Enzyme design. Sequence first.
Site, PDB file in Angstrom:
ATOM      1  N   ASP A  93      -9.936   1.262  -6.636  1.00 17.32           N
ATOM      2  CA  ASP A  93      -9.697   2.719  -6.648  1.00 17.32           C
ATOM      3  C   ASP A  93     -10.085   3.332  -8.006  1.00 17.32           C
ATOM      4  O   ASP A  93      -9.757   4.477  -8.285  1.00 17.32           O
ATOM      5  CB  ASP A  93      -8.264   3.055  -6.231  1.00 17.32           C
ATOM      6  CG  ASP A  93      -7.844   2.416  -4.856  1.00 17.32           C
ATOM      7  OD1 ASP A  93      -8.597   2.612  -3.892  1.00 17.32           O
ATOM      8  OD2 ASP A  93      -6.747   1.765  -4.733  1.00 17.32           O
ATOM      9  N   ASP A 100       0.837  -1.163   0.000  1.00 17.34           N
ATOM     10  CA  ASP A 100       0.000   0.000   0.000  1.00 17.34           C
ATOM     11  C   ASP A 100       0.902   1.255   0.000  1.00 17.34           C
ATOM     12  O   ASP A 100       1.813   1.339   0.831  1.00 17.34           O
ATOM     13  CB  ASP A 100      -0.913   0.007   1.216  1.00 17.34           C
ATOM     14  CG  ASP A 100      -2.007   1.043   1.086  1.00 17.34           C
ATOM     15  OD1 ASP A 100      -2.536   1.138  -0.047  1.00 17.34           O
ATOM     16  OD2 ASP A 100      -2.339   1.744   2.083  1.00 17.34           O
ATOM     17  N   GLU A 110       2.209  -0.800  -5.297  1.00 21.75           N
ATOM     18  CA  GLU A 110       1.230   0.156  -5.800  1.00 21.75           C
ATOM     19  C   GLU A 110       2.006   1.351  -6.368  1.00 21.75           C
ATOM     20  O   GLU A 110       2.866   1.910  -5.673  1.00 21.75           O
ATOM     21  CB  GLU A 110       0.288   0.633  -4.697  1.00 21.75           C
ATOM     22  CG  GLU A 110      -0.786   1.532  -5.278  1.00 21.75           C
ATOM     23  CD  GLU A 110      -1.627   2.286  -4.276  1.00 21.75           C
ATOM     24  OE1 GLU A 110      -1.254   2.371  -3.082  1.00 21.75           O
ATOM     25  OE2 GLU A 110      -2.665   2.829  -4.723  1.00 21.75           O
TER      26      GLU A 110
HETATM   27  O1  LIG Z   1      -8.986   7.524   3.628  1.00 18.01           O
HETATM   28  C1  LIG Z   1      -8.626   7.779   2.254  1.00 18.01           C
HETATM   29  C2  LIG Z   1      -8.980   6.495   1.478  1.00 18.01           C
HETATM   30  O2  LIG Z   1      -8.375   5.358   2.138  1.00 18.01           O
HETATM   31  C3  LIG Z   1      -8.509   4.119   1.480  1.00 18.01           C
HETATM   32  O3  LIG Z   1      -7.735   4.165   0.281  1.00 18.01           O
HETATM   33  C4  LIG Z   1      -6.565   3.330   0.125  1.00 18.01           C
HETATM   34  C5  LIG Z   1      -6.666   2.648  -1.254  1.00 18.01           C
HETATM   35  O4  LIG Z   1      -7.848   1.869  -1.464  1.00 18.01           O
HETATM   36  C6  LIG Z   1      -5.428   1.806  -1.449  1.00 18.01           C
HETATM   37  O5  LIG Z   1      -5.511   0.949  -2.595  1.00 18.01           O
HETATM   38  C7  LIG Z   1      -4.203   2.741  -1.542  1.00 18.01           C
HETATM   39  O6  LIG Z   1      -4.211   3.585  -2.727  1.00 18.01           O
HETATM   40  O7  LIG Z   1      -4.108   3.519  -0.310  1.00 18.01           O
HETATM   41  C8  LIG Z   1      -5.298   4.227   0.124  1.00 18.01           C
HETATM   42  C9  LIG Z   1      -4.985   4.827   1.496  1.00 18.01           C
HETATM   43  O8  LIG Z   1      -4.817   3.767   2.466  1.00 18.01           O
HETATM   44  C10 LIG Z   1      -9.961   3.844   1.142  1.00 18.01           C
HETATM   45  O9  LIG Z   1     -10.000   2.700   0.272  1.00 18.01           O
HETATM   46  C11 LIG Z   1     -10.675   5.037   0.490  1.00 18.01           C
HETATM   47  O10 LIG Z   1     -12.077   4.698   0.366  1.00 18.01           O
HETATM   48  C12 LIG Z   1     -10.465   6.261   1.363  1.00 18.01           C
HETATM   49  O11 LIG Z   1     -11.083   7.446   0.835  1.00 18.01           O
END
Ligand SMILES: OC[C@H]1O[C@H](O[C@H]2[C@H](O)[C@@H](O)[C@@H](O)O[C@@H]2CO)[C@H](O)[C@@H](O)[C@@H]1O
Lengths: 437, 437
Positions: free
Chosen positions: B294, B198, B227
């Site tokens: 995402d 992540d 990622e």
């Molecule tokens: O709180 C912000 C955001 O957090 C989560 O997003 C993750 C994402 O899904 C991962 O794949 C990666 O890109 O890191 C992010 C931050 O941990 C939640 O999935 C999202 O709904 C939320 O807005």
Amino acid sequence: PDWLADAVFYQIFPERFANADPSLDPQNVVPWGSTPTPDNFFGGDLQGIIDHLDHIVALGANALYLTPIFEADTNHRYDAKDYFSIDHRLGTLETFHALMAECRARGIRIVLDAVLNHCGDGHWAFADVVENEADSAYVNWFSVEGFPVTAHPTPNYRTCSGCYYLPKWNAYNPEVRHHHLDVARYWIDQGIDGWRLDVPYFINHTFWREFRTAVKGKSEDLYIVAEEWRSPVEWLQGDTADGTMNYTARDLILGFTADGGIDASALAAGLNALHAEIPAGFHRGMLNLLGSHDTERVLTRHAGDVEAALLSYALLFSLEGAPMVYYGDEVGLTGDNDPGCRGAMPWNEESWNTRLLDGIRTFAAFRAHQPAMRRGRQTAVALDADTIAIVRSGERAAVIVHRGEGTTVDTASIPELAPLDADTVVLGPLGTASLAT
Amino acid sequence: PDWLADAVFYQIFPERFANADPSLDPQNVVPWGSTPTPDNFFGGDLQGIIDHLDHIVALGANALYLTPIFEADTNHRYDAKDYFSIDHRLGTLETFHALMAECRARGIRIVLDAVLNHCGDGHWAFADVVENEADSAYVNWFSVEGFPVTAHPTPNYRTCSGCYYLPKWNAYNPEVRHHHLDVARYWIDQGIDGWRLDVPYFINHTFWREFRTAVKGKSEDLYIVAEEWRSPVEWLQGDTADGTMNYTARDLILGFTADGGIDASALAAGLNALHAEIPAGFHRGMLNLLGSHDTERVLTRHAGDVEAALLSYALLFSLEGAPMVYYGDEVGLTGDNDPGCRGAMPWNEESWNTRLLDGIRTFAAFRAHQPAMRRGRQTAVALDADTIAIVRSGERAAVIVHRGEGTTVDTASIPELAPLDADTVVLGPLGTASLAT
Ligand SMILES: OC[C@H]1O[C@H](O[C@H]2[C@H](O)[C@@H](O)[C@@H](O)O[C@@H]2CO)[C@H](O)[C@@H](O)[C@@H]1O
Ligand SMILES: OC[C@H]1O[C@H](O[C@H]2[C@H](O)[C@@H](O)[C@@H](O)O[C@@H]2CO)[C@H](O)[C@@H](O)[C@@H]1O
């Protein structure tokens, strides 16, 4: 006649194709988007045909099969009232001439519908006999039991299947034969390419021997094709026709692609049997089809499943003999059996299903680019309950047609496929592959 | 690690896959058909995963990529509150063990999501620091500016992108590193096959060098995938990861199959360039995809045009590197970007689009049966504005992908296609061909 190896037909029912000249329209013509009935007129016309020839060519057709166009009282025009004139709503002979010239400038041949078993209750000769009875000079050109002539409640004269507005022609009269054989000559003199025979089983083989000889004597290469819902074998002894409307193939194909009644083994055994029933030199005169003006529409037979219907067309374009598309079916029109299948042709291209259209053109292009697909021997080989190969050799060519959810085919292990190269072939759900050299 | 040449991934967001055990459900769980929000729980669970493994295998996948599953307060589970336990709504470690055993009995490898940049505002260590402040033994495991700790209206402590419920881990603390590196070991001891990173760009390369060495020391063949929404090159110098989520390929493909922005020349030049940017030995560690948790859903990006979306999948399964399908997309689910793409998985097969599903399996089958499709060199060659060949050689293999209305391809004249055989190939509207040997 050899040219049929390279022919692709588009059948048109002229009242519903295209209203170019709304001055020709009757007083109680209806709107173009109307529900078709046995009684209403949409004003389709011959100019409508000239103006949309490019669509025909674009689809991949180079022959037209036209249903009746002579002067008549019905919207179908099987009640002819003057065989020597174009129906006044269709156009004039000048309009007709103009259509012929445009056709020859694109390499499009024309076939008209010969309706010689019967004519209309409004024809001059029948209307005279009604008037001058036994003093009529035309009394014997029909089979009238007694006077006065009466239709309701049952006709007191011979008719096509008991329909009163269609009195039956007396073909045992040499005068009737003369007139009849002058029709076949008059329209041949106007640039015609052949004749389809309306219900030729309702007359006799001696007559149709006379008719071949008057036709083939204008030219050998003029094509004769018989209406026949059953076995074609009677018509292909080399004394009557060049082929039949191949309703036998129609029922075999739809059985497999739409009904689910017949599997691929059953399909191939029937197609080979039919090929063995048909006499040498006549296979390529067969006129192949999936529907017509006397059937429900292909897409309707398929319950709206477009990809399944593309399996129908793939098998259609693979067969030995000349394939015919019925107007509107290429663009996705739906409809039940007559009057339902005689819907109006929509011209706003946004309503068309262009993926079905473009699907069909792809099969046309492969056949046109492959000689063996036009003049090859036909052998059907089943691979699967849901998978069949139609093999054509002159150097093989082959279309494979899958109705299942997906499959793989091992070329090198099928002796009739082995002479092709690429080992295994891959087919998606409702898939098709077209191979050659 | 070589095994990635033969891998096919299915990404699952466990809260929305399958509610097998409704005893685990929270008090204000919602119905399975509900509209997904950032706040609601559908009760998806690990048993739901075990019970539907057969669908995964049937699709053609042999690896799973799971989004967070450790104890947490949100429905996404990026706010981890205890890294050493399965979230109480997901199941127990026994349920988890039971899932692992079934996976190994089918040859399905597992990847979990490593969230080491940050944790949740409800974690024991952050909740202690809130409570014992500068006397907390965990004060320095985070970056808290002052006391009292406050989130609203702006957090007075470091966080993931300013989100208060995600406090930022202090990775410059050797204690934090210890804990972090024990996570990576504890789950490897439970039968794990690898880790997705992540937001690894929010930490440092020295850390991720430490992380590779603790991971690869349990086993070389454990897979690390980063990622990364942009250039992959930083992560593929042979000291951090084995590959990245290939968002660069995603944008190239959808540009061509859905947007219309990019033609085939532009597609191939970008795919070859990307191949030239990526270092040797790392091409086949790339994790390829068309969407994720995402993004908006593939079919939604395609505006409901299913055949167009099948072009996406065809290019996906042709590329060097491992292709991943996102749960539901194979069966036709639609949805906008988060929360919209985290819809519930429907299980009444009558609502599925089985033609899209069966389309995708066909591309999976071809790749699996062709070694060159798994370990071949990749070269993209444009044929047309609307037609591209993805060529793979180890003996070539090639998928050709058409977005136009139909075409023909001359094999013998394309030098990279010439080493295949069958001269011309025929492609229908929105067509695809898969060739080999
Ligand atoms: O709180 C912000 C955001 O957090 C989560 O997003 C993750 C994402 O899904 C991962 O794949 C990666 O890109 O890191 C992010 C931050 O941990 C939640 O999935 C999202 O709904 C939320 O807005
Ligand atoms: O009046 C009965 C019937 O006549 C016409 O049918 C034609 C048919 O379309 C031809 O292809 C062929 O089979 O001969 C039939 C008799 O001439 C009309 O087309 C039909 O609507 C009508 O009921």
